[PDB]
Design an enzyme around this catalytic site. Structure first.
Site, short mmCIF file in Angstrom:
data_model
loop_
_atom_site.label_atom_id
_atom_site.label_comp_id
_atom_site.label_asym_id
_atom_site.label_seq_id
_atom_site.Cartn_x
_atom_site.Cartn_y
_atom_site.Cartn_z
N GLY A 1 0.88 -1.14 -0.24
CA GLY A 1 0.07 0.28 -0.10
C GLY A 1 0.69 1.39 0.04
N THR A 2 0.19 2.62 -0.07
CA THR A 2 0.84 3.78 -0.05
C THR A 2 1.31 3.94 1.32
OG1 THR A 2 -0.95 5.25 0.68
CG2 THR A 2 -0.94 4.53 -1.89
N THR A 3 2.17 5.02 1.47
CA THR A 3 2.68 5.19 2.87
C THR A 3 1.80 6.07 3.57
OG1 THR A 3 5.05 5.48 1.51
CG2 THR A 3 4.97 5.87 3.98
#
Lengths: 231, 243, 250, 235, 241, 244, 195, 240, 111
Positions: free
Chosen positions: B29-31
């Site tokens: 996933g995104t940070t």
């Protein structure tokens, strides 16, 4: 591979294959497009017939006076999800005397889809939806996927070869975004967008389906002789 | 073998492989990050711009629970929503019975026990998110991070997603260079920097920044989003630091 | 969530064996030896208190348990399985007997109830068999003294004397030699201690041996006086001291 | 094994696709929609000469204005017909009016996907639902176990269907009389049927606005069969 | 071998899931230790805080179950907290139903019975933890009772748990050979804590700062955990010896 | 999920058989032989215990023969524990009928319901069948003396003489050879034991490895008595027929 | 409903049951048969709360017919009476109890004896030489206590019944429109057509 | 509750559990039904590996559902009891609410429905039974014979057979049964029924059962002697 | 004891011409001897050229009207935007009212 038996199983790379296969039914579905200005939001859908004796499967379903969607994938799954949505728009009216925010409609669809992706014996929904609505904060377009992921966009398209329409809209952004207070022009931009996804076929009178909702226009559907205006 | 096909099965080394596979979805996933400050906490997240067609500012990912708790997560987005919906029910219930809003440590265990419960049976799948959350209660500020196994601890700073390691490193510097404390407005800027810095690990697509915060002094102990002048001011501070 | 295992985990193999009952019995085989001997005026049940570490307090671990004031049990196999069976066995003596007839169940019937519980774990959905065999010694007015063995299948048999677990084959042979129908309780205790020494390797004394009797009524153990027709429990756990006393004269 | 509600990697439900195979094994059913009525015809297909063929009920009344023909595992159709009748009669009770053919069909099609780990498997039978209503006139619907229903001017289902459908593609025009349609159904059935078509091993029915849904006697179809041979002999 | 995935017997009469749950017990790489004084019961556990970004105060494997009962867990924290919450609930309900504080050994038995069920019923997995319960019982005095994933439990004079459990165990065994008694013959819990730490140091061959340890003490009518400062005082007192 | 571990106890083989029933019958084939013989004036039940140890308490024991009511008894071949479950059911069911109609239950009706319970475990619920075969011996005023057998499939049949458990093939041929319709109880007793004597997997038949019961009209005029033989009584009947 | 009598003589049971069905101030019907044949040699008359009576009778009839088919055998009168008693004894503690009183007249073919059972709505059963439900008994029991003999013929029993009906027609306040009489004996159930 | 879908589709569109239930029926003892001009006869093979039977008390193969309808079967016997009970209960319930006994078609349709239901309900397997159901509708003299099978499909038959070697006896009935002229009498119909069983059975000793059903609940079991007469007379005619 | 009903007064009136119909009602709403509102309408356009009033206990009347309006909405959804005829509306309302036969809507209804 060994991990696609059911939705309750993660793959060793962290993927959910039943969800991904559910996503694949969308890809086999006939193309449909959504796009919107600040005043209106339009759905255009290519309908698919079984053969020359058959009717063309409806792709657009009305949810409320100010909201509705288009479908790509398993039709009965869209019927279930559209019915749920009709109920949610209805509950909001009867209880709160409040038109359901298109954004909340998005969240509710997301959470309904998600539960089928985490529990044994169920299955993910096998349909993708494009939700347009005009609410207290203007025109809206939503893209629903049965992974649960719902996204708000200026425009998009889903189904087979949806990539053509999606790049067109990505190019045309700054033009169509400002087609304010003109229904027929926004629809044309939509029909033009869907045309980028056609192959060995073009739009006919009983092949094409359009829906529009906006500032002073209830969500309404155009089929048959009422779409001839746009071919 | 086949120990990894069913949730809640122990492998011979004592592991639940399904939970470990859920972590892979998180790492994908995104940070997202959280920074604990003097009298508050700050949350920030990387939102990938998939396309021009995404309406900017209009796909909000940070979520409020009750009036004093902020939650952000990396991984499967709907799973995070399911977890927050549950958190909201838990906070409502606590409030209903005990009157006071739910303490953050108390709230953390409510998510903890619920997530952990999804590692107990093969009829459910573990949560595909790591969740950073926290807020301000009668005992001060708290920041927590919670993983698919149900494991959670309190943090000075925390990160998860693709840029988790870049952000961890950046967070360690702050913790080391500010033993006395970091202020809320300060932490809002650093948060923006660290997301821009942790965007290197994710850099085909450019992104949209999203920050939120609870501070006893700056937000009255309530969870508010950062927008307008204060957001742009923090975006600029980040823009500066990458050049 | 919810127990979605509503189907049997024990099933017949093509040869007609029930695998899980067979494997449960194998678990019982591995278990520490225990035995019971039936005298004319009593019954003795005995076993080894095989401790896990010397830092453990093996008095806190009771392998021989009171079920009713005239019924005691001992086992071989898995301890925790035995613990919950004793819990369930105690409660069933009340719910399905004492609360109905105002008196404690006779040995065979309590044994019958325990067996039922164990049979059900052999056929119900989503459970494995209990991994123990029980020896239940008891007295009741109309049947006198009795001793039963209950296996993972839920099968029970009345015994003059027997042993179960680790060194049962040897112990059963030693009991066939020594048992007769004229044994007094003290003689059976003596034989029990002898039969048990065969199977114990390390220390052999009143702290490593657990041993109870179903014998005479114990008014001193009743807790109250004034109802002469109430005479107290026939079940008595022999003290650490009491056992050592009998090992000097072994 | 692997759950009843599983998707294939192509994005299709295994169990629904497998039921579609079972339907292909079924006896032929044909429907044709005209401005004068809708005809429904089926291949009876007695599995032995000793079986009394008028006991083979594969065309069925749902309401006075709606009829239904089936192909596939026909025992699976009983409860679909039961639901359909109940829905039609219930609608009339609630609204003092005839239920729309489309609404009836949608109601039956809701049953379809209510299977899993609700019933244990999909239906192994497809239905041709034909009828009339004030709003949309004479209609024919093909109701599958996927929960999808399609409107058709004409349609064939069962074993003879790809051959029969291609034939219907040519022969259907928007001005077919009822009589022409009756003959077409007989013609196309005789083509795709294994054994030789007659009044005993095939059955006809129609639904007109005026007289509603009627199954034809063996005498009436016998005359149509005789008439069909004479029109083909003559060119 | 699906007999290795759920809690049914293997052909040699074994429950592999229970055995593998014991292996999860050491996943945290922490060792714990419990001893009894005249007046008290002390439980010490190593405290390892690897990441600098953590809030060290929130990192704990000791739990206050009731006013009188403390519990240290050897195992992963999610299962540990699952067991802690349940034990707290069970101890509260017991007080409500029966009108007195749930005893250490009874709570131990109750949690052991709960663990036993997971070894017999297929839909429930065992918890990968070992639970060491401590108190000064009002009837039995200082008490240590320990629970494992098999559903086994017993009382101890003293005990240890973790990867290097055996070293600590024999260290303690050797003391009680020498001391000739059931407990630490000491007045104050402070000196019993000092004993506990001292013998942990010998058996592990390692030195501790105030933040390397975690200490729980049970006296009559309260169980409490020590702060780093209280532990530092204790370490100092040992060093000046 | 859990589907992985489901044995599917209630399915058909491709040959149209019920695996679990077949294997239950295979289990039953190693159980102590039980024999029922019906005469004009009574019924004999005789059964062999699975290899006794000398230390077994022989008189306080019942492994093979059970009393269902005053007019009906059963001989068991299979898992004892399983059989007791079904016996209590049968005992209750007999009492319900008596309570409802104020008449002792007709033998077949009791038999049918037990057989129906067994049948259920083969068709639904996903549980293993009861590994038990019964011989029912009983009397009612409609059909007089009756013998029935039921097995794990829930199928039941009536008999003049029948065996269940081990060596039924051998036993059935011996019974078929020497049985005559006009036989008396005491002849039936003799036949029962002589059949076990020849089919047993033991060295020779002794009193301690036997259970024995009769249902005669042996009491006071037109009323029926069940006799579950004590050890000493079997010992005598063994001598009185010259087997020991 | 109202009048139902039964007399058990030497070789038969005779049941008499009034023909009137009244609601309010209207006799709605004067030819009502307040009886169900349970089995070929067992008859049940009934009286009580409107609706309940027929509903209960037909429910019992259905059950006894089901038993007859299942076993291909006719339950004895005693057994049927016990079945019927149990259903009433159940019902009296239900949410809404069957308010029905019955007489069961049967010929037991194993014993070759007629039997008469009187069961009220509470589930109170008694076997009697003669019985009645409702106010009827207040006249007939004493009348039969005098005139009845155990060894009477069916023909004598019918005359004894005429006495009972005559008295009820003289002293009862309501017009019950005569009775339908039915005999149960070794040859089954028949109806006397002129009474 | 036990939930599992046991009856499910396979890639070729077959439901193996239904089809395997048919294999169980194939293994069952043969049963045939033939309808005359004025009667229906049910005949049943009884397998002859079993002596020491008690025939007084052993379940007869033809069962009365009501006094005017009978049911015979081939397949699992224990399964057949369940269907027979339900049908009997339905028969009594139909009389209770319609005030008329069941038609043979109705009773058949009900039993067929039960069978179908067990082919798409979770946790249960299909009935390993096919039935022949015969009798006369109330106040009707036209004879009725229907067949059901595990799938739940049912239909009417001038004559039909089920169970082991039913193909052999169906073959026989197919060349020996004239639609134009059905067995004019009881005598005739019983004879054709016995002849067909004798293609498959053995001796018509304790091996054939015959049940005759006439109108107005006139149903009787034939016994050894009278069957034996038919066996006897059939063979002596056959020596040509 | 709690009384779940009240009486909100007013009166309504419907008349049918050859090619029209009217539904009239006063706008007064009362309890006991007090006026709650001088303008609170109780005659509503329900769509599909149906007008409706449910007079008596206003809470029940508003609930019924609300439910009927909803019934029309779903009738369109479920039957392809078909027009709800007055005869079909009447029958639908019978089921709405009779569904509460054992705890009625205390209203006189006219459409």
């Amino acid at each position: 591979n060994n991990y696609d038996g059911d939705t309750v199983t993660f793959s060793p790379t962290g993927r959910l294959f039943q969800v991904e296969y559910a996503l694949e039914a969308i890809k086999q579905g006939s193309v449909t497009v959504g796009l919107r200005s600040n005043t209106h939001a339009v759905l255009v859908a290519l309908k698919r017939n079984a053969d020359e004796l058959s009717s063309y499967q409806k792709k657009i379903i009305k949810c409320d006076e100010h909201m509705g969607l288009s479908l790509a994938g398993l039709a009965p799954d869209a019927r279930v999800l559209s019915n749920y949505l009709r109920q949610q728009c209805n509950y909001s009216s009867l209880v709160f005397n409040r038109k359901l925010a298109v954004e909340r409609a998005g969240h509710l669809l997301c959470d309904k889809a998600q539960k089928n992706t985490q529990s044994y014996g169920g299955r993910p929904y096998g349909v993708g939806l494009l939700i347009i609505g005009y609410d207290k904060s203007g025109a809206h377009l939503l893209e629903f996927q049965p992974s649960g992921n719902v996204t708000e966009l200026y425009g998009t398209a889903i189904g087979a070869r949806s990539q053509g329409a999606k790049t067109y809209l990505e190019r045309t952004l700054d033009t169509f975004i400002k087609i304010d207070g003109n229904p027929d022009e926004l629809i044309k931009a939509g029909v033009e967008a869907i045309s980028q996804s056609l192959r060995d076929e073009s739009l006919t009178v009983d092949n094409l389906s359009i829906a529009i909702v906006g500032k002073d226009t209830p969500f309404t559907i155009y089929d048959g002789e009422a779409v001839a205006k746009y071919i | 073998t086949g120990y990894d096909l069913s949730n809640s099965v122990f492998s011979p080394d004592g592991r639940n492989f399904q939970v470990e596979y859920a972590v892979k979805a998180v790492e994908n996933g995104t940070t997202s990050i959280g920074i604990k400050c003097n009298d508050g906490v700050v949350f920030a997240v990387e939102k990938l711009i998939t396309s021009k067609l995404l309406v900017p500012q209009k796909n909000v990912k940070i979520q409020v629970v009750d009036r004093h708790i902020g939650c952000v997560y990396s991984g499967l987005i709907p799973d995070g929503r399911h977890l927050v919906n549950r958190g909201r029910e838990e906070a409502a219930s606590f409030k209903k019975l005990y009157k006071t809003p739910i303490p953050i440590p108390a709230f953390a265990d409510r998510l903890g026990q619920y997530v952990q419960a999804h590692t107990l049976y093969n009829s459910v799948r573990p949560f595909g998110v790591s969740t950073i959350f926290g807020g301000v209660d009668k005992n001060g500020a708290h920041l927590y991070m919670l993983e698919p196994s149900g494991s959670y601890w309190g943090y000075k700073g925390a990160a998860t997603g693709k840029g988790r390691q870049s952000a961890k490193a950046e967070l360690e510097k702050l913790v080391d260079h500010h033993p006395e404390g970091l202020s809320a407005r300060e932490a809002v800027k650093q948060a923006a920097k660290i997301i821009y810095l942790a965007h290197e690990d994710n850099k085909e697509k450019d992104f949209e920044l999203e920050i939120s915060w609870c501070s006893l002094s700056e937000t009255n102990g309530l969870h508010k989003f950062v927008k307008g002048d204060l957001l742009q001011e923090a975006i600029d501070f980040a823009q500066k630091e990458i050049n | 969530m919810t127990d979605r295992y509503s189907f049997s985990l024990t099933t017949f193999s093509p040869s007609g064996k029930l695998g899980q009952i067979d494997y449960a019995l194998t678990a019982v085989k591995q278990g520490v030896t225990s035995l019971g001997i039936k005298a004319t005026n009593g019954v003795v049940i005995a076993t080894e208190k095989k401790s896990s570490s010397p830092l453990a307090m093996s008095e806190t671990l009771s392998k021989v348990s009171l079920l009713t004031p005239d019924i005691g049990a001992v086992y071989s196999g898995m301890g925790p399985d035995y613990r919950v069976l004793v819990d369930k066995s105690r409660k069933v003596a009340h719910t399905s007997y004492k609360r109905i007839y105002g008196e404690y169940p006779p040995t065979k019937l309590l044994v019958s109830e325990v067996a039922k519980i164990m049979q059900e774990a052999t056929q119900s959905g989503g459970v494995r068999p209990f991994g123990v065999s029980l020896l239940i010694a008891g007295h009741d007015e109309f049947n006198g003294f009795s001793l039963y063995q209950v296996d993972p299948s839920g099968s029970y048999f009345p015994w003059k004397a027997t042993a179960i677990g680790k060194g049962s084959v040897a112990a059963k042979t030693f009991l066939e030699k020594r048992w007769n129908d004229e044994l007094e309780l003290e003689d059976a205790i003596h034989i029990a201690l002898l039969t048990l020494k065969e199977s114990v390797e390390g220390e052999f004394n009143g702290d490593t041996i657990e041993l109870a009797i179903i014998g005479d009524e114990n008014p001193d153990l009743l807790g109250y006086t004034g109802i002469p027709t109430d005479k107290g429990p026939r079940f008595r756990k022999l003290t650490s001291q009491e056992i050592n006393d009998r090992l000097e004269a072994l | 094994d692997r759950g009843v509600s599983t998707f294939s990697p192509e994005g299709r439900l295994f169990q629904v696709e497998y039921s579609l195979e079972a339907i292909k094994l079924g006896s032929t059913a044909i429907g044709i929609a005209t401005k004068e009525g809708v005809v429904l015809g089926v291949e009876k297909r007695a599995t032995s000469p000793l079986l009394e063929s008028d006991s083979i009920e594969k065309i069925v009344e749902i309401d006075r204005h709606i009829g239904c023909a089936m192909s596939g595992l026909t025992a699976d159709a009983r409860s679909m017909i039961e639901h359909a009748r109940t829905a039609a009669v219930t609608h009339n009770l609630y609204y003092d009016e005839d239920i729309n053919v489309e609404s009836l069909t949608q109601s039956v099609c809701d049953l379809a996907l209510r299977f899993g780990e609700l019933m244990s498997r999909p239906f192994g039978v497809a239905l041709l639902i034909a009828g009339h209503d004030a709003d949309d006139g004479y209609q024919l619907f093909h109701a599958e176990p996927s929960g999808t229903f399609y409107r058709y001017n004409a349609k064939a289902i069962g074993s003879g269907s790809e051959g029969a459908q291609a034939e219907l593609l040519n022969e259907w025009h928007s001005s077919l009389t009822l009589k022409e349609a009756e003959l077409l159904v007989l013609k196309i059935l005789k083509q795709v049927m294994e054994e030789k078509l007659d009044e005993n091993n095939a059955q006809l029915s129609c639904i007109t606005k005026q007289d509603g849904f009627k199954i034809y006697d063996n005498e009436k179809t016998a005359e149509l069969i005789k008439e069909l041979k004479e029109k083909e002999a003559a060119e | 071998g699906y007999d290795r995935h759920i809690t049914i017997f293997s052909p040699e009469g074994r429950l592999y899931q229970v055995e593998y749950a014991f292996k999860a017990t050491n996943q945290t790489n922490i060792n714990s230790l419990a001893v009894r004084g005249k007046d008290c019961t002390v439980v010490i556990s190593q405290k390892k805080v690897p990441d600098k970004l953590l809030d060290p105060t929130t990192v704990s494997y000791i739990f206050c179950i009731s006013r009188t009962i403390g519990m240290v867990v050897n195992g992963p924290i999610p299962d540990a907290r699952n067991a802690a919450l349940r034990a707290k609930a069970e101890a509260a309900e017991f007080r409500y139903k029966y009108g007195y504080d749930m005893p250490c050994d009874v709570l131990a038995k109750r949690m052991a019975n709960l663990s036993q069920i997971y070894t017999q019923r297929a839909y429930m997995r065992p918890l990968g933890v070992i639970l060491t319960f401590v108190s000064v019982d009002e009837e039995l005095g200082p008490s240590i009772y320990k629970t494992d994933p098999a559903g086994y439990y017993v009382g101890y004079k003293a005990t240890a748990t973790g990867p290097k459990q055996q070293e600590i165990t024999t260290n303690l065994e050797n003391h009680f050979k020498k001391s000739k008694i059931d407990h630490i013959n000491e007045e104050s819990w402070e000196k019993v804590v000092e004993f506990a730490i001292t013998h942990m140091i010998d058996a592990l061959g390692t030195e501790f700062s105030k933040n390397d340890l975690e200490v729980g003490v049970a006296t009559k009518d309260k169980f409490f955990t020590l702060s780093a400062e209280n532990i530092e005082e204790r370490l100092v007192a040992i060093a000046e010896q | 999920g859990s589907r992985r571990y489901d044995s599917r106890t209630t399915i058909f083989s491709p040959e149209g058989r019920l695996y679990q029933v077949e294997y239950a019958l295979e289990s039953i084939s190693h159980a102590g032989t039980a024999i029922g013989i019906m005469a004009s004036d009574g019924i004999v039940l005789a059964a062999e215990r699975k290899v006794t140890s000398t230390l077994l308490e022989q008189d306080t024991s019942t492994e093979k023969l059970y009393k269902l009511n005053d007019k009906i008894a059963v001989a068991v071949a299979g898992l004892t524990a399983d059989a007791e479950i079904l016996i209590n059911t049968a005992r209750i069911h007999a009492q319900n009928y008596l309570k409802t109609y104020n008449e002792d239950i007709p033998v077949e009706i009791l038999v049918r319901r037990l057989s129906d319970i067994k049948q259920g475990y083969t068709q639904h619920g996903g549980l293993r069948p009861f590994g038990v075969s019964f011989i029912y011996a009983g009397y009612d005023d409609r059909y007089g003396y009756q013998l029935y057998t039921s097995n794990p499939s829930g199928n039941y049949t009536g008999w003049k003489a029948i065996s269940v458990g081990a060596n039924t093939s051998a036993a059935q041929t011996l019974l078929q050879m020497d049985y005559k319709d006009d036989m008396k109880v005491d002849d039936a007793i003799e036949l029962a034991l002589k059949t076990l004597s020849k089919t047993t997997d033991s060295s020779a038949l002794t009193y301690d490895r036997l259970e024995f019961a009769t249902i005669r009209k042996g009491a006071n005029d037109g009323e029926v008595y069940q006799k579950i033989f004590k050890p000493q009584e079997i010992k005598d009947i063994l001598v009185k027929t010259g087997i020991t | 409903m109202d009048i139902i009598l039964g007399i058990r003589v030497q070789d038969s049971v005779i049941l008499a049951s009034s023909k009137a069905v009244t609601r309010g101030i209207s006799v709605l019907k004067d030819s009502d048969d307040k009886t169900r044949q349970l089995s070929p040699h067992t008859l049940m008359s009934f009286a009580g709360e409107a609706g309940d009576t027929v509903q209960f009778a037909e429910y019992i009839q259905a059950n006894i017919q089901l038993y007859s088919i299942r076993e291909d055998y006719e339950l004895s009168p005693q057994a049927v009476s016990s079945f019927v008693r149990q259903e009433l004894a159940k019902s009296i503690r239900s949410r809404r109890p069957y308010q029905v009183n019955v007489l069961i007249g049967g010929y037991d073919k194993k014993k070759n004896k007629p039997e008469l059972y009187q069961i009220d709505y509470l589930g109170t059963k008694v076997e009697l030489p003669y019985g009645a439900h409702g106010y009827s008994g207040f006249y007939t029991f004493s009348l039969l206590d005098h005139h009845y003999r155990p060894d009477m013929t069916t023909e004598e029993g019918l005359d004894l019944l005429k006495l009972c009906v005559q008295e009820l027609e003289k002293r009862m306040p309501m017009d019950f429109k005569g009775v339908i009489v039915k005999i149960v004996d070794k040859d089954g159930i028949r109806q006397v057509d002129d009474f | 509750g036990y939930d599992r879908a046991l009856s499910i589709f396979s890639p070729d569109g077959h439901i193996f559990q239904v089809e395997y239930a048919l294999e169980a029926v194939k293994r069952g003892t043969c049963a045939v039904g033939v309808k005359g001009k004025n009667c229906v006869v049910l005949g049943c093979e009884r397998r002859s590996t079993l002596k020491l039977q008690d025939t007084r008390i052993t379940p007869s193969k033809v069962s009365k559902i009501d006094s005017h309808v009978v049911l015979s079967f081939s397949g699992l016997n224990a399964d057949s009891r369940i269907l027979i009970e339900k049908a009997r209960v339905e028969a009594q319930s139909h009389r209770l609410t319609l005030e008329d006994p069941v038609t043979v078609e109705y009773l058949t349709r009900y039993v067929a429905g039960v069978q179908q239901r067990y082919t798409q309900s979770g946790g249960v397997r299909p009935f390993g039974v096919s039935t022949l159901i015969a009798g006369f509708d109330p106040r009707d003299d036209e004879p009725k014979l229907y067949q059901t099978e595990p799938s739940g499909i049912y239909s009417s038959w001038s004559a039909q057979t089920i169970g082991r070697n039913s193909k052999t006896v169906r073959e026989f009935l197919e060349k020996n049964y004239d639609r134009k002229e059905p067995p004019a009498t009881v005598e005739e119909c019983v004879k054709l029924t016995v002849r067909s069983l004798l293609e498959v059975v053995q001796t018509g000793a304790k091996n054939i059962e015959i049940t005759v059903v006439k109108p107005d609940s006139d149903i009787v079991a034939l016994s050894s002697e009278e069957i034996n007469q038919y066996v006897t007379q059939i063979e002596q005619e056959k020596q040509e | 004891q709690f009384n779940p009903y009240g009486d909100n007064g007013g009166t309504i009136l419907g008349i049918a011409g050859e090619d029209f119909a009217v539904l009239a009602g006063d706008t007064r709403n009362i309890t006991d001897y007090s006026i709650n509102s001088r303008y609170e309408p109780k005659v509503f356009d329900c769509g599909d050229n149906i007008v409706m009033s449910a007079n008596g206990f206003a809470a029940d009347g508003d609930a019924l009207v609300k439910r009927f309006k909803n019934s029309v909405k779903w009738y369109h959804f479920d039957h392809n935007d078909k027009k709800l005829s007055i005869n079909s509306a009447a029958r639908n309302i019978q089921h709405l009212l009779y569904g509460k036969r054992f705890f009625p809507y205390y209203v006189h209804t006219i459409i």
